[PDB]
Amino acid sequence: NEAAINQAIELHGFPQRHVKVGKEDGAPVRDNDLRRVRTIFDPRTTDANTAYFTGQDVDVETLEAHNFDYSAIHEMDMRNLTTALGLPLEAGNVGADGLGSGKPAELRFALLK
């Protein structure tokens, strides 16, 4: 599950840029054409302050960071592993509401002792 998240963050935790070339039902575009477009909009040489200038038949589109709750997956994984090892949930650096106070807490400290 850790390996899954580690890979998934690189793909889905960050956006990506999708440059689209040509027109709907328009002229054909080929690899040697895209090679020039790629050279212009290259992330390797792009700076944050940049501006782009085009005709109407070039588009820049966004693959968003397609959000998922990897934090809650981490918490479930850690909940499983800690309690499987007999350790308290807190030993995995995972918090919970209420369960840090009073007899709800002190019982788990008793179990550990």
Binding site: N80, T83, A84, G86, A110, L111
Partner: peptide, 15 residues
């Protein structure tokens, strides 16, 4: 076979 299932009965024994 371990896991949370085994740990609960072991906690029960320890109490």
């Amino acid at each position: 076979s371990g896991g949370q299932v085994a740990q609960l009965m072991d906690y029960k024994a320890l109490l």
